[PDB]
Coordinates of C-alpha atoms in Angstrom, one line a residue:
Chain A
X1 CA 82.3 176.9 139.5
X2 CA 80.3 180.1 139.0
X3 CA 80.1 181.7 135.5
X4 CA 80.1 185.4 134.5
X5 CA 77.3 187.6 133.0
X6 CA 74.2 185.4 133.5
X7 CA 75.4 181.9 132.8
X8 CA 74.5 178.7 134.8
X9 CA 76.8 177.8 137.6
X10 CA 78.6 174.7 136.4
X11 CA 78.6 171.8 138.8
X12 CA 82.0 170.1 138.5
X13 CA 81.0 166.6 137.3
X14 CA 82.9 163.3 138.0
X15 CA 85.3 163.3 135.0
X16 CA 86.4 166.7 136.4
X17 CA 84.7 168.8 133.6
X18 CA 82.2 171.2 135.1
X19 CA 78.7 170.4 133.8
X20 CA 75.4 172.2 134.3
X21 CA 72.8 171.7 137.1
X22 CA 69.7 171.5 135.0
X23 CA 69.8 167.7 134.3
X24 CA 70.1 164.4 136.1
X25 CA 72.7 164.0 138.8
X26 CA 74.1 161.0 140.7
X27 CA 75.3 162.2 144.1
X28 CA 77.8 159.8 145.7
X29 CA 76.6 160.3 149.3
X30 CA 80.1 161.0 150.8
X31 CA 80.3 163.9 148.4
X32 CA 77.0 165.2 149.6
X33 CA 78.5 165.3 153.1
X34 CA 81.4 167.6 152.5
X35 CA 79.3 169.6 150.2
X36 CA 75.7 170.4 151.4
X37 CA 76.6 174.1 151.9
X38 CA 76.8 174.1 148.1
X39 CA 74.2 171.4 147.3
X40 CA 71.5 173.4 149.1
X41 CA 72.5 176.7 147.4
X42 CA 72.7 175.7 143.8
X43 CA 71.3 172.3 143.0
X44 CA 68.5 172.4 145.6
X45 CA 66.9 175.6 144.3
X46 CA 67.1 173.7 141.1
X47 CA 65.4 170.5 142.1
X48 CA 62.4 172.4 143.5
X49 CA 62.0 174.2 140.2
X50 CA 61.5 170.7 139.0
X51 CA 64.5 170.7 136.6
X52 CA 67.1 168.5 138.1
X53 CA 66.1 165.1 139.4
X54 CA 69.1 164.0 141.6
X55 CA 69.9 160.5 142.9
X56 CA 71.6 160.7 146.3
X57 CA 73.5 157.4 146.3
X58 CA 73.9 156.2 149.8
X59 CA 74.2 152.5 150.6
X60 CA 71.9 151.7 153.5
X61 CA 70.4 154.5 155.5
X62 CA 68.2 154.7 158.6
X63 CA 64.7 156.0 157.5
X64 CA 62.2 158.2 159.4
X65 CA 58.6 158.2 158.1
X66 CA 56.1 161.0 158.5
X67 CA 52.4 160.2 157.8
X68 CA 50.5 163.3 156.7
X69 CA 46.9 163.7 155.8
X70 CA 46.0 163.5 152.0
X71 CA 42.8 165.5 152.7
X72 CA 44.7 168.7 153.6
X73 CA 47.4 170.2 151.4
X74 CA 51.1 169.8 152.2
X75 CA 54.5 170.5 150.6
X76 CA 57.2 168.1 151.6
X77 CA 59.9 170.6 150.9
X78 CA 60.7 171.8 154.4
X79 CA 60.8 168.3 156.0
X80 CA 63.6 167.8 153.5
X81 CA 65.4 171.2 153.5
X82 CA 65.8 170.7 157.3
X83 CA 67.2 167.2 156.8
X84 CA 69.7 168.8 154.5
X85 CA 70.7 171.4 157.1
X86 CA 71.6 168.5 159.4
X87 CA 74.2 166.8 157.3
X88 CA 77.8 167.4 158.4
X89 CA 80.9 166.1 156.7
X90 CA 80.5 163.9 159.8
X91 CA 77.0 162.4 159.9
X92 CA 73.6 162.5 158.2
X93 CA 70.1 162.3 159.9
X94 CA 67.8 159.3 159.1
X95 CA 66.4 160.1 155.6
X96 CA 62.9 161.2 156.1
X97 CA 60.0 160.2 153.8
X98 CA 56.5 161.7 154.0
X99 CA 53.7 159.3 153.5
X100 CA 49.9 160.0 153.3
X101 CA 47.8 158.2 156.0
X102 CA 45.7 155.6 154.1
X103 CA 42.0 156.7 154.2
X104 CA 38.8 154.5 154.5
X105 CA 36.5 156.4 152.0
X106 CA 37.3 157.9 148.6
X107 CA 38.3 161.4 149.8
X108 CA 39.1 164.5 147.6
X109 CA 42.9 165.1 147.9
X110 CA 45.0 168.3 147.9
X111 CA 47.9 168.3 145.3
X112 CA 51.0 167.9 147.6
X113 CA 54.5 168.3 146.3
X114 CA 57.0 165.6 147.2
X115 CA 60.7 165.1 146.5
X116 CA 62.2 162.2 148.5
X117 CA 61.3 158.7 147.3
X118 CA 63.5 155.5 147.4
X119 CA 64.3 153.3 144.5
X120 CA 64.6 149.9 146.3
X121 CA 61.4 148.4 147.7
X122 CA 61.9 149.4 151.3
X123 CA 58.3 148.9 152.3
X124 CA 58.8 145.7 154.2
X125 CA 57.3 146.4 157.6
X126 CA 54.0 148.0 156.5
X127 CA 52.2 144.8 157.8
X128 CA 48.8 146.2 157.5
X129 CA 47.1 149.2 155.8
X130 CA 43.8 149.6 157.6
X131 CA 43.3 147.1 160.4
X132 CA 39.9 148.1 161.7
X133 CA 38.6 149.8 158.4
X134 CA 36.2 147.7 156.4
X135 CA 38.4 148.6 153.4
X136 CA 41.0 151.2 152.7
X137 CA 39.9 153.6 149.8
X138 CA 42.6 156.2 149.1
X139 CA 45.6 155.0 151.1
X140 CA 47.5 151.9 149.8
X141 CA 45.5 148.9 150.9
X142 CA 48.0 146.4 152.4
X143 CA 46.1 143.3 153.5
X144 CA 48.0 141.4 156.2
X145 CA 50.5 139.5 154.0
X146 CA 49.8 135.7 154.4
Chain B
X1 CA 42.1 185.2 148.8
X2 CA 40.1 182.3 150.3
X3 CA 41.9 180.4 153.0
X4 CA 41.0 176.7 152.5
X5 CA 42.2 173.0 153.0
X6 CA 43.6 171.7 149.7
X7 CA 45.6 174.2 147.6
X8 CA 48.9 172.7 146.4
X9 CA 51.2 174.6 148.7
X10 CA 54.6 175.3 147.1
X11 CA 57.7 176.5 148.9
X12 CA 59.7 179.4 147.5
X13 CA 62.1 178.0 144.9
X14 CA 64.9 180.0 146.5
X15 CA 65.1 180.1 150.3
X16 CA 64.2 183.8 151.2
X17 CA 65.8 183.2 154.6
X18 CA 69.4 183.8 153.8
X19 CA 71.3 185.7 151.1
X20 CA 74.6 184.2 149.8
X21 CA 77.5 186.3 148.4
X22 CA 77.7 184.9 144.9
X23 CA 81.3 186.1 144.4
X24 CA 82.3 184.7 147.8
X25 CA 79.6 183.3 150.0
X26 CA 79.4 185.4 153.2
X27 CA 75.6 185.1 153.6
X28 CA 73.3 187.8 154.9
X29 CA 70.0 188.1 156.8
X30 CA 68.3 190.7 154.6
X31 CA 68.8 191.2 150.9
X32 CA 69.8 194.7 151.8
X33 CA 72.9 193.6 153.8
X34 CA 73.9 191.5 150.8
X35 CA 74.0 194.5 148.6
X36 CA 76.8 195.9 150.8
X37 CA 79.0 192.9 150.5
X38 CA 78.6 193.1 146.7
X39 CA 79.0 196.9 146.7
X40 CA 81.9 196.9 149.2
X41 CA 84.0 193.8 149.4
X42 CA 83.3 192.8 145.8
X43 CA 83.6 195.9 143.6
Chain C
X1 CA 89.2 207.2 112.2
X2 CA 87.9 204.5 109.9
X3 CA 84.5 203.6 108.4
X4 CA 84.3 201.2 105.5
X5 CA 84.1 197.5 106.6
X6 CA 83.4 195.0 103.8
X7 CA 81.8 191.9 105.3
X8 CA 80.3 188.5 104.4
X9 CA 77.6 186.5 106.1
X10 CA 78.1 182.9 107.4
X11 CA 77.4 179.9 105.2
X12 CA 74.3 177.7 105.6
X13 CA 76.1 174.4 104.8
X14 CA 73.1 173.4 102.8
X15 CA 70.5 174.1 105.5
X16 CA 67.3 176.1 104.9
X17 CA 67.4 179.0 107.3
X18 CA 70.4 180.3 109.3
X19 CA 71.8 177.8 111.9
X20 CA 70.2 179.2 115.1
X21 CA 66.8 179.5 116.7
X22 CA 64.8 181.8 119.0
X23 CA 66.4 180.8 122.3
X24 CA 69.9 182.0 121.2
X25 CA 68.8 185.6 121.4
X26 CA 67.9 185.5 125.1
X27 CA 70.9 183.4 126.2
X28 CA 73.9 185.5 125.1
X29 CA 76.1 186.6 128.0
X30 CA 76.5 190.3 129.1
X31 CA 74.0 192.7 127.6
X32 CA 70.6 191.0 127.1
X33 CA 70.2 190.2 123.4
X34 CA 72.9 192.6 122.2
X35 CA 75.3 190.5 120.1
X36 CA 77.7 193.4 119.9
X37 CA 80.6 193.4 122.4
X38 CA 79.8 189.8 123.4
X39 CA 82.3 187.1 122.4
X40 CA 84.6 187.3 125.5
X41 CA 81.7 187.9 127.9
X42 CA 81.3 184.4 129.3
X43 CA 85.0 184.6 130.2
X44 CA 84.8 188.0 132.1
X45 CA 85.3 186.2 135.4
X46 CA 87.9 183.5 135.6
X47 CA 87.4 180.7 138.1
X48 CA 90.0 178.2 136.9
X49 CA 91.9 176.6 134.0
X50 CA 89.0 174.4 132.9
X51 CA 87.5 175.7 129.5
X52 CA 84.1 177.3 129.9
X53 CA 81.5 175.2 128.0
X54 CA 78.0 174.0 128.9
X55 CA 75.4 171.7 127.4
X56 CA 74.2 173.8 124.4
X57 CA 77.7 175.2 123.9
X58 CA 79.9 172.0 123.7
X59 CA 83.1 174.0 123.1
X60 CA 85.2 177.2 123.4
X61 CA 84.5 178.6 119.9
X62 CA 80.9 177.5 120.4
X63 CA 79.9 180.8 121.9
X64 CA 81.3 182.7 118.9
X65 CA 80.3 180.3 116.2
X66 CA 76.7 180.8 117.3
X67 CA 76.8 184.6 117.6
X68 CA 78.0 184.5 114.0
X69 CA 74.9 183.0 112.2
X70 CA 72.8 184.9 114.7
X71 CA 74.7 188.0 113.6
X72 CA 74.4 187.5 109.8
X73 CA 70.7 186.6 110.1
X74 CA 70.1 190.2 111.2
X75 CA 72.4 192.1 108.9
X76 CA 70.1 193.5 106.2
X77 CA 71.7 196.9 106.7
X78 CA 75.1 197.4 104.9
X79 CA 73.7 194.9 102.4
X80 CA 70.3 196.4 101.7
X81 CA 69.8 199.6 103.6
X82 CA 66.6 198.4 105.4
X83 CA 66.3 196.9 108.9
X84 CA 64.1 193.9 108.2
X85 CA 63.2 191.1 110.7
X86 CA 63.9 187.4 111.1
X87 CA 61.2 185.3 112.8
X88 CA 59.8 188.2 114.6
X89 CA 63.1 189.7 115.8
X90 CA 64.5 193.1 115.0
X91 CA 66.9 195.8 116.3
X92 CA 65.5 198.6 118.6
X93 CA 66.5 201.6 116.5
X94 CA 69.1 202.8 113.9
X95 CA 72.0 202.6 116.4
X96 CA 71.5 198.8 116.3
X97 CA 71.8 197.7 120.0
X98 CA 69.9 194.7 121.4
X99 CA 67.4 192.6 119.5
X100 CA 63.7 192.9 120.7
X101 CA 60.6 191.3 119.2
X102 CA 59.1 193.1 116.2
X103 CA 57.4 196.4 117.4
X104 CA 53.7 196.7 116.6
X105 CA 52.0 199.6 114.8
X106 CA 55.0 199.9 112.4
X107 CA 56.7 196.5 111.8
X108 CA 59.8 196.2 109.5
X109 CA 59.8 194.1 106.3
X110 CA 60.5 190.4 106.6
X111 CA 64.1 189.5 105.8
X112 CA 64.6 187.4 102.7
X113 CA 66.7 184.4 103.9
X114 CA 69.9 184.3 101.7
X115 CA 73.3 182.6 102.0
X116 CA 76.5 184.6 102.0
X117 CA 75.2 188.2 101.6
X118 CA 78.0 190.7 100.7
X119 CA 78.2 193.6 103.2
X120 CA 79.1 197.0 101.7
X121 CA 78.8 199.0 104.9
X122 CA 78.4 202.3 103.0
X123 CA 75.0 201.0 101.9
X124 CA 73.7 202.0 105.4
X125 CA 74.3 205.9 105.5
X126 CA 73.2 206.0 109.1
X127 CA 76.4 204.2 110.2
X128 CA 78.9 207.0 109.2
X129 CA 76.4 209.6 110.5
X130 CA 76.6 207.9 113.9
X131 CA 80.0 206.3 114.1
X132 CA 81.0 207.0 117.7
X133 CA 78.0 205.2 119.0
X134 CA 77.7 202.0 116.8
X135 CA 81.5 201.5 116.5
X136 CA 81.7 198.0 118.2
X137 CA 79.5 196.7 115.4
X138 CA 82.4 197.3 113.0
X139 CA 84.8 195.2 114.9
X140 CA 82.3 192.4 115.4
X141 CA 81.2 192.2 111.7
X142 CA 84.9 192.1 110.8
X143 CA 85.2 189.0 113.0
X144 CA 82.2 187.3 111.4
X145 CA 83.9 188.0 108.0
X146 CA 87.2 186.4 109.0
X147 CA 85.2 183.4 110.3
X148 CA 82.9 183.2 107.3
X149 CA 85.7 183.2 104.8
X150 CA 86.8 179.8 106.1
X151 CA 85.2 176.4 106.7
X152 CA 88.1 175.4 109.0
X153 CA 89.4 178.0 111.5
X154 CA 89.3 181.8 111.5
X155 CA 91.8 183.4 109.0
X156 CA 93.6 186.3 110.8
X157 CA 96.7 188.2 109.6
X158 CA 100.4 188.5 110.7
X159 CA 102.8 191.2 109.4
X160 CA 105.9 192.6 111.1
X161 CA 107.8 195.6 109.5
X162 CA 111.3 195.7 108.1
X163 CA 112.6 197.8 110.9
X164 CA 112.6 197.2 114.7
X165 CA 109.7 197.9 117.2
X166 CA 108.9 201.6 117.6
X167 CA 110.0 203.5 120.7
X168 CA 106.4 204.0 121.8
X169 CA 105.5 200.4 121.2
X170 CA 108.2 198.9 123.5
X171 CA 107.0 201.2 126.3
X172 CA 103.3 200.2 125.8
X173 CA 103.9 196.5 125.6
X174 CA 105.8 196.4 128.9
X175 CA 102.4 196.3 130.7
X176 CA 101.0 193.0 129.4
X177 CA 103.8 190.9 130.9
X178 CA 102.2 188.3 133.2
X179 CA 99.1 188.0 131.0
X180 CA 98.1 184.6 129.3
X181 CA 97.3 184.6 125.6
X182 CA 93.7 183.8 126.6
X183 CA 93.6 187.2 128.4
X184 CA 95.5 189.1 125.7
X185 CA 92.7 188.2 123.3
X186 CA 90.2 189.5 125.7
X187 CA 92.0 192.8 126.3
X188 CA 92.8 193.2 122.6
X189 CA 89.2 192.7 121.4
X190 CA 87.6 194.7 124.2
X191 CA 90.0 197.5 123.1
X192 CA 89.1 197.9 119.4
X193 CA 85.4 197.4 120.2
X194 CA 84.2 200.4 122.1
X195 CA 85.6 203.7 120.7
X196 CA 86.7 204.7 117.1
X197 CA 90.5 204.4 117.1
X198 CA 93.0 205.4 114.4
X199 CA 95.0 203.0 112.1
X200 CA 98.2 204.5 113.4
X201 CA 97.3 204.6 117.1
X202 CA 100.0 203.4 119.6
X203 CA 97.7 200.7 121.0
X204 CA 97.1 199.3 117.5
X205 CA 100.7 198.9 116.3
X206 CA 101.6 197.3 119.7
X207 CA 98.7 194.8 119.7
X208 CA 99.6 193.8 116.2
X209 CA 103.2 193.5 117.3
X210 CA 101.9 191.4 120.1
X211 CA 100.1 189.0 117.8
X212 CA 102.9 188.4 115.3
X213 CA 105.2 188.1 118.4
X214 CA 102.8 185.3 119.6
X215 CA 103.0 183.3 116.3
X216 CA 106.8 183.0 116.6
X217 CA 106.3 181.6 120.1
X218 CA 103.6 179.2 118.9
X219 CA 106.0 178.0 116.3
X220 CA 108.9 177.9 118.7
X221 CA 111.0 180.4 116.9
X222 CA 110.5 183.0 119.6
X223 CA 111.3 180.9 122.7
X224 CA 113.2 181.7 125.9
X225 CA 116.5 182.1 124.1
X226 CA 115.3 184.1 121.1
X227 CA 113.1 187.2 121.7
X228 CA 111.7 189.5 119.0
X229 CA 112.5 192.5 121.2
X230 CA 112.6 191.2 124.7
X231 CA 109.1 189.6 124.5
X232 CA 108.1 186.0 124.1
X233 CA 105.7 183.3 125.4
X234 CA 106.8 180.5 127.8
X235 CA 104.9 177.3 127.3
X236 CA 104.1 174.9 130.2
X237 CA 103.9 171.1 130.0
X238 CA 101.2 170.0 127.5
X239 CA 99.9 167.5 130.0
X240 CA 99.7 170.3 132.6
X241 CA 97.5 172.8 130.7
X242 CA 99.2 173.9 127.5
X243 CA 96.8 176.8 127.2
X244 CA 99.0 178.9 129.4
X245 CA 101.2 181.2 127.4
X246 CA 102.0 184.6 129.1
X247 CA 104.2 187.3 127.6
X248 CA 107.4 187.0 129.6
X249 CA 110.2 189.6 129.3
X250 CA 113.9 188.7 129.1
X251 CA 117.3 190.1 128.0
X252 CA 118.7 187.3 125.9
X253 CA 119.8 187.2 122.3
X254 CA 117.1 188.9 120.2
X255 CA 116.5 188.0 116.6
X256 CA 116.6 190.5 113.7
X257 CA 114.2 192.5 111.5
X258 CA 113.5 190.6 108.2
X259 CA 114.8 191.8 104.8
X260 CA 111.2 192.5 103.8
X261 CA 107.6 192.6 105.0
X262 CA 106.1 189.2 105.9
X263 CA 102.4 190.1 105.5
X264 CA 100.6 186.7 105.6
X265 CA 97.2 185.4 106.5
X266 CA 97.1 182.3 108.7
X267 CA 94.5 179.6 109.4
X268 CA 94.0 176.5 111.5
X269 CA 92.7 173.7 109.1
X270 CA 92.4 171.2 111.9
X271 CA 88.9 171.4 113.6
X272 CA 90.9 171.4 116.9
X273 CA 90.6 175.2 117.1
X274 CA 87.0 174.7 118.2
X275 CA 87.7 173.5 121.7
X276 CA 91.2 175.1 122.1
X277 CA 90.9 178.5 124.0
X278 CA 94.5 179.1 122.9
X279 CA 93.8 178.9 119.2
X280 CA 90.5 180.9 119.4
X281 CA 92.4 183.5 121.4
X282 CA 95.3 183.7 118.9
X283 CA 92.8 184.2 116.1
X284 CA 90.6 186.8 117.6
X285 CA 93.6 188.7 119.1
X286 CA 94.9 189.3 115.5
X287 CA 91.4 190.1 114.2
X288 CA 91.3 193.1 116.6
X289 CA 94.0 194.8 114.5
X290 CA 92.5 194.1 111.0
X291 CA 89.3 195.7 112.4
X292 CA 90.5 199.3 113.0
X293 CA 92.6 198.8 109.9
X294 CA 90.8 197.0 107.1
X295 CA 92.6 194.1 105.3
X296 CA 96.1 195.1 104.3
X297 CA 95.4 193.3 101.0
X298 CA 93.1 190.6 99.6
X299 CA 93.1 187.0 100.6
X300 CA 94.4 184.2 98.4
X301 CA 91.7 182.0 96.7
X302 CA 94.3 179.2 96.5
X303 CA 92.3 176.9 98.8
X304 CA 89.5 178.1 101.2
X305 CA 85.9 176.9 101.1
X306 CA 83.7 176.7 98.0
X307 CA 81.7 179.7 98.9
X308 CA 84.5 182.3 99.6
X309 CA 85.5 182.0 95.9
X310 CA 86.0 185.5 94.6
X311 CA 84.4 187.8 97.1
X312 CA 83.7 191.5 96.5
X313 CA 86.5 193.1 98.4
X314 CA 87.7 190.3 100.6
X315 CA 89.1 187.4 98.7
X316 CA 90.7 187.9 95.3
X317 CA 92.9 185.9 92.9
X318 CA 95.2 188.4 91.2
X319 CA 98.5 189.9 92.3
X320 CA 97.1 192.2 95.0
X321 CA 96.4 189.1 97.2
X322 CA 98.4 187.8 100.1
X323 CA 98.9 184.0 100.4
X324 CA 97.2 182.2 103.3
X325 CA 99.4 179.7 105.1
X326 CA 97.2 177.3 107.1
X327 CA 98.5 174.9 109.7
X328 CA 97.4 172.1 112.1
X329 CA 97.7 172.3 115.9
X330 CA 99.3 168.8 116.4
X331 CA 102.0 169.1 113.7
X332 CA 102.6 172.7 114.6
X333 CA 103.2 172.0 118.3
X334 CA 105.2 168.9 117.2
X335 CA 107.4 171.3 115.2
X336 CA 107.3 173.8 118.1
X337 CA 108.9 171.3 120.5
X338 CA 111.5 170.5 117.8
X339 CA 112.6 174.1 117.8
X340 CA 113.2 174.0 121.6
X341 CA 115.5 170.9 121.2
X342 CA 117.5 172.5 118.4
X343 CA 118.7 175.4 120.6
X344 CA 119.1 173.3 123.7
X345 CA 116.1 174.3 125.9
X346 CA 114.9 170.7 126.3
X347 CA 116.8 167.4 126.3
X348 CA 116.7 165.1 123.2
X349 CA 114.6 162.8 125.5
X350 CA 112.0 165.5 126.2
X351 CA 111.7 165.8 122.4
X352 CA 109.8 162.6 121.9
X353 CA 108.3 163.0 125.3
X354 CA 106.4 166.3 124.8
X355 CA 105.1 164.9 121.5
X356 CA 103.3 161.9 123.2
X357 CA 102.0 164.2 126.0
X358 CA 100.6 166.6 123.5
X359 CA 99.3 164.2 120.9
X360 CA 97.4 162.6 123.8
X361 CA 96.0 166.0 124.7
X362 CA 95.0 166.9 121.1
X363 CA 93.4 163.5 121.0
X364 CA 91.1 164.6 123.9
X365 CA 90.2 167.6 121.7
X366 CA 89.3 165.2 118.8
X367 CA 87.5 162.7 121.0
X368 CA 85.4 165.6 122.3
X369 CA 84.4 167.3 119.0
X370 CA 83.5 164.1 117.2
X371 CA 81.3 163.1 120.1
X372 CA 79.6 166.5 120.0
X373 CA 78.9 166.7 116.3
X374 CA 77.1 163.4 116.5
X375 CA 75.1 164.6 119.5
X376 CA 74.3 167.9 117.7
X377 CA 74.2 167.2 114.0
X378 CA 73.3 170.2 111.8
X379 CA 69.9 169.5 110.3
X380 CA 68.5 169.8 113.8
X381 CA 68.6 173.5 113.7
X382 CA 71.7 175.2 115.3
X383 CA 75.4 174.9 114.5
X384 CA 77.4 175.0 117.8
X385 CA 79.9 172.6 116.3
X386 CA 80.1 173.4 112.6
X387 CA 80.1 170.1 110.5
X388 CA 83.9 169.4 110.1
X389 CA 83.6 165.7 109.2
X390 CA 85.6 162.9 110.8
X391 CA 87.7 162.3 107.7
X392 CA 90.0 165.1 108.7
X393 CA 91.6 166.0 112.2
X394 CA 95.0 165.0 110.9
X395 CA 95.5 165.9 107.2
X396 CA 97.9 168.8 107.9
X397 CA 98.1 171.1 104.9
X398 CA 101.0 173.5 104.4
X399 CA 101.8 173.7 108.1
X400 CA 105.4 173.1 107.1
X401 CA 105.2 176.4 105.2
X402 CA 103.8 178.3 108.1
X403 CA 106.8 177.2 110.2
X404 CA 109.1 178.4 107.4
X405 CA 107.3 181.7 107.6
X406 CA 108.2 182.2 111.3
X407 CA 111.8 181.4 110.5
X408 CA 111.7 184.1 107.8
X409 CA 109.6 186.5 109.9
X410 CA 112.4 186.5 112.6
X411 CA 115.9 186.0 111.0

């Protein structure tokens, strides 16, 4: 619900009592499907500003990875904004998570801005972090689990 | 300005691409066109 | 027109400085930091029935309760003559518009923090010499006065003459028909707060006739079968948004002008007024009248808070005072439903039904405020809730006398 003369647009909370976007929200996935058009226009501009951590609560999703290079700078916002623009009241695209490619040496890294990160430990197929490398240095070493 | 590798790139906090009617929602390409919805339809 | 408003600054409740910080100045709706012509600003655009309240402002009367201490904290004029400045904040110029940070080169004197400073108005000669520009400030200060002279709900003022509604009043009122009480408060206030009107203006005697005509409805005396002069307020189910009032027009059996004037100040002791947009509207809708026309008399010192005891020209104790009949939302509406059953509007079964549906609603009002006062104490800094204490919420004072006033106000 929008508010007059410069007042925050209240986001109708669960109990059915419009609350304000600058806070911590829990988005029952289904909701996020018949609502993105809104999400992206009021809560999204908010999350980027770094003032409204939101938990999209979806049971078990498919998950696309995207390894970028920690050397160079990157801002994970568009590989997310796009994912949002592909959510119909019908179906959502496999949640995409950006992940730095694990380096061998101790490289200087560019401050990247990330947003998507799962709560449950869904890193169960990593297998190995730097097969050939004599030792991973910046990436997350993941010695072949015995 | 010195183009370089690392330099914490940060997306615009409000997508400059489209412009939503705040009263209604009929979006617009250029900010300009959105002034017309708010000056015409909503006035 | 009129220029001589005697005010009174908000109480501190035992706190050091006035209950509000720096952020309150740049958060007010409408015109930047201009506290004048604010109040009903966050309600300018209606989206739905749900009462507008955010995180910092946990209630309906929260927006106003804050603009009050923020108002008094910057009211050296009328009470000193100077302009001063509180925490590096002052008015732009003599007209007194928005509040900007203290100007360099020639900064004003620091305001001496004080509790309950009597406002004389004439003490600031620039006011009368520039009335048509800084007129809203008169209406607003008057509001703060009515809110300050009470620790439990704004004390407005009902009246009603001995004779029937004027011929110019009945023609002016037939324009606010399908308009909720929430909106009548917005149109009333926005009226008397933008241009110097006269005490005997057509829109003034009609808005006053609209306020006292609302009290009878709130008490149930002026229902669907008993109009004051063809105007009343139909109330919906309490479980289905009781805030809806609306001034419906009918042609039933009108009442009758009383034998004498029923001038009487009213108050809402129960802290329920805080979250009820209907109570805050009824209060501010009446205050709009006592603005253009200063207090018809003095207020009774009978009860009231411990700080409003014997004010300069506001609260007296002699014979020139008018008694203040304070009520309580729950028992008032419980007696309001009882009136409907007496004349046959509702069945004897809907009598004890509407009571349970309303007492459950008023419970939500209580469960909300108690949970907000604990979240936002008082020693923290601000006062968006106003420390009411949980020992009350249901100690109904002379509400039974306010009801007897409505029966006498419309015989």
